[PDB]
Amino acid sequence: GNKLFNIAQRILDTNSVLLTERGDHIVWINNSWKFNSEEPLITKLILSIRHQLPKEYSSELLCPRKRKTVEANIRDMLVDSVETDTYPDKLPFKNGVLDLVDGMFYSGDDAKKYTCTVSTGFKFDDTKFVEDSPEMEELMNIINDIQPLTDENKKNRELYEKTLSSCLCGATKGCLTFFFGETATGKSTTKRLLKSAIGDLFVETGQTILTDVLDKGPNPFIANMHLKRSVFCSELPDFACSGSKKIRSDNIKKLTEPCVIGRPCFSNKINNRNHATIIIDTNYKPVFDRIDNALMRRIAVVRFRTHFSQPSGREAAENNDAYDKVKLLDEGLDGKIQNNRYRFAFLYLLVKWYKKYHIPIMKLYPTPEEIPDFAFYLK
Amino acid sequence: GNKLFNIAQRILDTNSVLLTERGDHIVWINNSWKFNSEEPLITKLILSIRHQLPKEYSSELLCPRKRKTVEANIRDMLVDSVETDTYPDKLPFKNGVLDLVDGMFYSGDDAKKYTCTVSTGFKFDDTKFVEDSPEMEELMNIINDIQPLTDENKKNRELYEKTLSSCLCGATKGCLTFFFGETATGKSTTKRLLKSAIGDLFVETGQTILFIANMHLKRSVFCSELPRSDNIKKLTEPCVNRNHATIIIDTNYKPLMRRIAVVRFRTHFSQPSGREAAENNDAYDKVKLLDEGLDGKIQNNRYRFAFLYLLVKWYKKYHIPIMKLYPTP
Amino acid sequence: GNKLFNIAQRILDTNSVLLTERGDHIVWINNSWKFNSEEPLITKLILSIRHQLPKEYSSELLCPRKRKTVEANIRDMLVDSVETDTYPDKLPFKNGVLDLVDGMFYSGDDAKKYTCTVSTGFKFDDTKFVEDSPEMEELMNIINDIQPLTDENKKNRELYEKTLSSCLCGATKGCLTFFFGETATGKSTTKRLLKSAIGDLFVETGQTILTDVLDKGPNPFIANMHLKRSVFCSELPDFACSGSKKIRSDNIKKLTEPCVIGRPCFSNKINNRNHATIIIDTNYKPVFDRIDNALMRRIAVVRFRTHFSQPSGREAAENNDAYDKVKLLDEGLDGKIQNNRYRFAFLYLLVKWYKKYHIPIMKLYPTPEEIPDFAFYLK
Amino acid sequence: GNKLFNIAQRILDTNSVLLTERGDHIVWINNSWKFNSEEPLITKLILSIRHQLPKEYSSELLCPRKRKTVEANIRDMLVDSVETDTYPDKLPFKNGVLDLVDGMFYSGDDAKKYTCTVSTGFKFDDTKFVEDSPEMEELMNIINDIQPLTDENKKNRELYEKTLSSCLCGATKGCLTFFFGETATGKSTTKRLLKSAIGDLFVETGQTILTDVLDKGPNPFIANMHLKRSVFCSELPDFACSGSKKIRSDNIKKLTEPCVIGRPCFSNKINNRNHATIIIDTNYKPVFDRIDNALMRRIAVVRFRTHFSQPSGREAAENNDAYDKVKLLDEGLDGKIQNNRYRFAFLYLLVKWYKKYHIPIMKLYPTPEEIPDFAFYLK
Amino acid sequence: GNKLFNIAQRILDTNSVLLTERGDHIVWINNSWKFNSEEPLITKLILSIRHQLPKEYSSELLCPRKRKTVEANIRDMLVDSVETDTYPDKLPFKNGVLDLVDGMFYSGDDAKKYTCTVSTGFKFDDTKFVEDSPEMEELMNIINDIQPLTDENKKNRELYEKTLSSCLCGATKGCLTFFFGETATGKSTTKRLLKSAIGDLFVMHLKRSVFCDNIKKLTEPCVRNHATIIIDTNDNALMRRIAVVRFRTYRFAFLYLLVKWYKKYHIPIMKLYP
Ligand SMILES: Nc1ncnc2c1ncn2[C@@H]1O[C@H](COP(=O)(O)OP(=O)(O)OP(=O)(O)O)[C@@H](O)[C@H]1O
Ligand SMILES: Nc1ncnc2c1ncn2[C@@H]1O[C@H](COP(=O)(O)OP(=O)(O)OP(=O)(O)O)[C@@H](O)[C@H]1O
Ligand SMILES: Nc1ncnc2c1ncn2[C@@H]1O[C@H](COP(=O)(O)OP(=O)(O)OP(=O)(O)O)[C@@H](O)[C@H]1O
Ligand SMILES: Nc1ncnc2c1ncn2[C@@H]1O[C@H](COP(=O)(O)OP(=O)(O)OP(=O)(O)O)[C@@H](O)[C@H]1O
Ligand SMILES: Nc1ncnc2c1ncn2[C@@H]1O[C@H](COP(=O)(O)OP(=O)(O)O)[C@@H](O)[C@H]1O
Ligand SMILES: [Mg+2]
Ligand SMILES: [Mg+2]
Ligand SMILES: [Mg+2]
Ligand SMILES: [Mg+2]
């Protein structure tokens, strides 16, 4: 009858192409559900699936004139929407999906059932997600240095591990984490390690969403933070000075609900999924316009204490009261972070921490017995 | 005469395509009227209706270059506009239409008569719209926990009843409902339950209104995070876009007098650690242990059809003769 | 079986075309990776590679109707992304790549391995990169006039050399360098020499990035400093006047991060790589909103002392305390800089300085004692 | 092998089409490098060069469909970018290039070497560029009435000559000139004479470039003054009033740098070559925010003294100290300026002045002693 | 020659498509001059006029690729613009034009002559514009209740009648009218009755009634301003533009009485006293 239509029928039989409720056409090639709303990746798939059809159905796909007709057919046989990103406890890599509860790796058809559109962005090398390795040893030493495992720093350490490991599951976190710490303490190093670990599922935005009207006009910062598991926020200046705007109370509640509102540029989708762990890398005590019970149950704070300095300024940091330990700075560490030498080691550590506090359920608990004004509000 | 034109005339004979006064062409496929003013959904229909024309008129529709000629023809015959969404006592699902006065579910050609261009977005599973089911029991318990049926809170429960059941009719209401209450009282829980129930007929906007292009033919609009009297009057009018939705405001403090209704939340949910800190507070009348796993089984839509049946029974209790909302000064 | 497809397969074999994570299709023509998001530069490569295939596959390549079919076929085979600009110690010219650790010049296939998308913009002439030449002698005299090799000007000269030579490596710099100095001193001369030396890998922006929230709406100034290796910021108004806004302290923290957030116009990429050395051509001592140890470890200051003047006002400059030496102005010097007379000589000087302080590892230290308020804050 | 490709190769052999670093395909037709970055002017070339190819390659180019194939090919052989507007002592007319150092006119191939993208906009009539003509006599009378050749008005006349003549050279001038003078004195007359003389290479902007932040958002006033050789700025209001903001000094400092920073509408290029002589048609004494040494060496001023008035108000002008000689208003003069009666006469006068002060090296010197506050800052 | 050219010539012969000075291509289908410079409606007319041409010229209009050719020919054949809404005393209904000088109703080609772009929004039922109707009795009673016909309220009711009748003709009014009155009096009811009466042409270009230096910027021919401006509230150059009526205490019938009121004081000319 029509060969260019039977080809589309066969391609639709394998369920490689799907249409989501957002209007996009997610496509499954190279063991990853991919989407991009300026280029029809479907015409890629037609070529990639070419070596799966009968011989006479494959020699006709080597022509862009006959590979946009089949795309036109396929685009008119996708009438029903399919919901995506349902399973929260999955980590999607550019070549499969890893199950967190048991630490096994899926590939091919086994990874297709869990429709995870957003991926980490890098392949999952099997012979690096190991327990014993020199990189793992030095990473563990570095993490011990950043957060010492002492008795009075045990609750803080466990909260640090909980917050870091929470940036792996796609559930809607109900709390925001503050990263208060003084100069040269380890906040940015932890951020870079996390970014090299989880990859594409990690975005850092500005402080506009923290304190501004996140409703007027286009705001791509909210638009990019859709299905992103980890969100970081720098730009936390002191609010004790004149002219500095306080952190808006309603923004915290707006960022903690399971479907945030925000329109990108040249579009009208104002619904964005909220899988993000929102971490606010600050340097001073933050303040809010008003304090109420609607905020003391949404703030979690972890304190970084150990400091890294050169020997010249070593003696100037020993007497500081906000400082609990002065370690030696490593000038070459930041070089071997962007080189991704501690990528899979940190991934293994994060998975081990995840299957230690979030196995039954996931929930981040607030802890306001760490903010002075919140302490005043708590009698 | 002309095959590609007889095909278009036959497709227009079935009345599967109609032109709305808003300038958008509505499409009838999979037992639901859909529209999208950014794509020629019409070219979808011309393929689906392929199994309704004779064999010689069907093999010619497997060709995208020949499925835009007939689409152009169809677009050039739709001159007379036809009104849409005129029945207010109907609820459209992705696979049919449910009547509210009777509770009977219409599907197929019977669903085509009511031109409902909007829909909830999910298929109406038949063996879930039942009265007795464990999910219904636990949902009913949750609703009682949020709003107990005490002698003092009977009028408040009745007003909450009317307001929630009002999120089913396609007419224009004339009153704005507030959700004043303290923290951990169930406002967001009620919003999420209603999202699981009614689905797509649901939008939440910012505080600027107190965006507008999205509140067209929707049946429920909300605005949370409340930290203009003329806007209340501008919203309760039947042309803002058809204002067929009810407006609910999720606030925490105390925020024309004949257009505002307020329903209060008294129950407080807390962990055992902070239980004692809420017993002595006057803002709550009862404190119950917080359910950590309840939020998880909402996005799963475990209590979707249970709340839908509750809403239908709830509607056929106050709005059967007419629909109207009375302000509480 | 298909000539238009075999041509694309052969082109893909040579790895002349690659796809970057930024959605860009970089192209290898004339010993340089070129890219233009507004022009399918691929069709240039598709033509220029025409003298590499068999004769039957070459005469078919002289047709624009069959040269967009090959680019259509190629655009559906680039499914994976390739990371670009990873090697930090390389300098890309429009006809090759120069290795900094040895001074060797690489071209052809040896230049293809280091994927350096951004290049200087000019060819590398071999018979100019020499130590003995009149241009080199007069440039050395010029530089010794700008920064004399005295004993009190020894540390400043070394810091000046380090800062100037750092604008060759693609690493990230965590230190901002100011160019404080009085009028007619030679800041703009150094800027122009640097621009003539490195070419495209050099931009100058406004002072908004220093004192403004670079998040609100589009900000092309942040958007253009992507993979640039040197960024100058002139227009430093005196902040002692009323209504002048002080330098935003957190912008300094942002500019030293490995990746910055800023959106361009008519696009939606908020991730900009930061290879830039930020130099602030100022005329007065800068002030900030707040001073903290998180700022004093990011700032280094060089001093320009020698003054250039006409003989009419020479006596009025001898008694000034802001100049340690008065030299005779050269009217024609500003002419033979835009003529690129001192281009390869300054490039040789920069390379010679680079293989003197940045060979083991690159790092720019701060000099907090050179600022009055900073000097107050240590004690 | 392919006629449509050999035609493009032959066209590229004559170097009639070039690719600029700004992304524009400059075209060489009618002895003028023309470009327009909204319509591909190349096609005009493809037709105009039609009478230079063999006959078999000529009658074919009469079809618009063919000329899109040749243009599509030519767009694909231009990889090497070219620099433009390098020679400063050349004046480009719509039909050639005039050499300023000899007063000799070039047209044709010898005019192609100096790649000058911007032209005056009118043909150069050879039989008007003469010493003796009635128009020359009346223009000389007009100019001697505007600036009399007295002994006390000799330096001012020379500075007026130098400032006017500097609007012919393509180098970057480093000084700002004012046209201070009272009412009905001859400032707009000089502006209109200059506009009729140099034509396109002359723009007039507002005071935004002088007293405003030319960095926030789009600002076309800085995008039009790219490669323009003269920029007039009238409407300098009295700053003695309330709310009137002073002239920004850093604006002056940026207006005299080789490339100025400013973005246009619907584009992203920020750098524009500053070949402009900046003249401010002021009416009152200007004041700035802060006064320093960096502002002394960028400010020059000429004073207009002769007053033109009707005989009715002639008596009221004799006793005024702001005027040194009262002439009679010529009502018909303004009419015979927009008719370009004194176009080539003033062009010859400007060239004669150019070969009197700018032959060895072109430089604009300041006059800081002609302003009261500046004189106060002077010692 | 060309069939596709003679078709365009015939279509322009009937004067169905016209070009306006605003850059629009008004088109004539369903007995209404409907225009929209966002949707090229012209193609529809090429099909609509399809059953008016010879069959040889009509059987080639069943092709979209040969109906953008006729549209192209027509589009570059309309060189001279036309002006619209030149007859103030007309009322455009979706099925014709109602003359206001006498009250006769027109439809079709004779309705095509009046180039009115903005219609009332509803069709004109022929067997409702009658004097005797129970709904007309009810509306008359409602009007009497709102504005009693007393002697002390005769000037007030006369000015009320004139102000209401002004919102029927398309000329340029030059007097603002006030509705100063207390709550629960019937001003909003009057507005609703007026909106049901005249429909689309009551809401600000080509509109005939508006509800609410400005008093001068709202009383000049071009802002075109065809609307009587009335504000629903609770220098010598200013007194000559303000008229006040005080409030103290059924669509086609309302149109009928409006027409009768109009043909009582504005038959020679229209002008509203302050
Ligand atoms: N375990 C470690 N051992 C040695 N050096 C370390 C270790 N962890 C981090 N460092 C180094 O110590 C320095 C700490 O800088 P870091 O970016 O963590 O500070 P910060 O808290 O972000 O500072 P700022 O307040 O200025 O933002 C870096 O150079 C980092 O590479
Ligand atoms: N019937 C119930 N029984 C037990 N727990 C419940 C019940 N209803 C709700 N909860 C729990 O109580 C929690 C309180 O959150 P809730 O949705 O009431 O917040 P909210 O009113 O929006 O808060 P805020 O005022 O701080 O913005 C819910 O998240 C849910 O887990
Ligand atoms: N070594 C040198 N020998 C002679 N002349 C020099 C030398 N170095 C610079 N000059 C000249 O001295 C002047 C220095 O001014 P320059 O243009 O470099 O700006 P600057 O000193 O930063 O000015 P300002 O601070 O006032 O903006 C220029 O005219 C330059 O040509
Ligand atoms: N040499 C001359 N002889 C006679 N009349 C002249 C001569 N030069 C100029 N004029 C005339 O004198 C008048 C002066 O007008 P002009 O444009 O010079 O004023 P202006 O300085 O721009 O004005 P203002 O400062 O009042 O705004 C004009 O009518 C001009 O034509
Ligand atoms: N004369 C009347 N006839 C019928 N209904 C009336 C009359 N006067 C007032 N009403 C009723 O009063 C209600 C409110 O009147 P309203 O329009 O608010 O008065 P006002 O114009 O002073 O605001 C209306 O719904 C209307 O039905
Ligand atoms: Mg940091
Ligand atoms: Mg809430
Ligand atoms: Mg300078
Ligand atoms: Mg003037």
Short mmCIF file of N, CA and C in Angstrom, two decimals, chain A residues 41 46 52 95 143 178 186 228 233 236 244-245 257-258 262 265 270 307-308 330 335 341 361-362 371:
data_model
loop_
_atom_site.label_atom_id
_atom_site.label_comp_id
_atom_site.label_asym_id
_atom_site.label_seq_id
_atom_site.Cartn_x
_atom_site.Cartn_y
_atom_site.Cartn_z
N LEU A 41 14.36 15.60 16.70
CA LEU A 41 15.24 14.43 16.83
C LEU A 41 14.65 13.16 16.24
N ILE A 46 14.88 7.71 13.03
CA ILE A 46 14.58 6.98 11.80
C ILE A 46 15.85 6.38 11.22
N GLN A 52 17.20 -2.19 12.03
CA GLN A 52 16.28 -3.09 12.72
C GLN A 52 15.12 -3.55 11.85
N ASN A 95 23.81 6.04 29.22
CA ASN A 95 23.79 4.71 28.64
C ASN A 95 22.95 3.72 29.45
N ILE A 143 36.70 14.39 52.09
CA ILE A 143 35.40 14.61 52.71
C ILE A 143 35.52 14.62 54.23
N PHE A 178 20.63 25.33 53.65
CA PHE A 178 21.58 26.43 53.68
C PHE A 178 22.99 25.89 53.90
N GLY A 186 35.01 24.97 52.27
CA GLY A 186 34.68 23.76 51.53
C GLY A 186 33.35 23.78 50.81
N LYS A 228 15.17 19.14 37.16
CA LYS A 228 16.52 19.15 37.69
C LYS A 228 16.49 18.71 39.15
N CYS A 233 22.41 27.94 44.59
CA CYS A 233 22.19 29.39 44.52
C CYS A 233 23.30 30.12 45.26
N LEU A 236 24.71 35.51 47.78
CA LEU A 236 24.07 35.80 49.05
C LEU A 236 24.83 36.90 49.79
N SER A 244 19.98 46.56 50.48
CA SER A 244 19.90 45.13 50.20
C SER A 244 18.51 44.61 50.53
N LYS A 245 17.90 43.91 49.59
CA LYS A 245 16.56 43.38 49.76
C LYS A 245 16.61 42.04 50.49
N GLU A 257 6.77 23.75 46.47
CA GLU A 257 5.56 23.06 46.05
C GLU A 257 5.84 22.22 44.81
N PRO A 258 5.08 21.14 44.58
CA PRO A 258 5.52 20.13 43.60
C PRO A 258 5.38 20.56 42.14
N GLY A 262 6.29 29.27 36.21
CA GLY A 262 7.26 30.11 35.52
C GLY A 262 7.27 29.89 34.02
N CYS A 265 11.29 32.01 27.84
CA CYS A 265 11.23 33.01 26.79
C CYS A 265 10.64 32.41 25.53
N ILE A 270 3.78 27.38 31.86
CA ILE A 270 4.02 27.94 33.18
C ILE A 270 4.00 26.89 34.28
N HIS A 307 38.89 24.69 57.93
CA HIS A 307 39.36 25.72 57.01
C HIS A 307 40.66 25.29 56.34
N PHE A 308 40.85 25.74 55.11
CA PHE A 308 42.02 25.40 54.31
C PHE A 308 42.79 26.67 53.99
N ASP A 330 45.16 22.68 49.37
CA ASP A 330 45.74 21.91 48.28
C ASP A 330 45.55 22.69 46.99
N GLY A 335 42.17 21.51 40.39
CA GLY A 335 42.51 21.05 39.05
C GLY A 335 41.99 19.65 38.78
N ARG A 341 38.18 13.27 38.24
CA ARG A 341 38.90 12.15 38.83
C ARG A 341 38.13 11.54 40.01
N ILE A 361 11.35 5.76 52.94
CA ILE A 361 10.74 6.93 52.32
C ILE A 361 11.80 8.03 52.24
N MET A 362 11.43 9.13 51.59
CA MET A 362 12.27 10.32 51.52
C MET A 362 11.56 11.48 52.20
N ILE A 371 19.25 29.04 63.90
CA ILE A 371 19.16 30.42 63.44
C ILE A 371 18.83 31.28 64.65
#
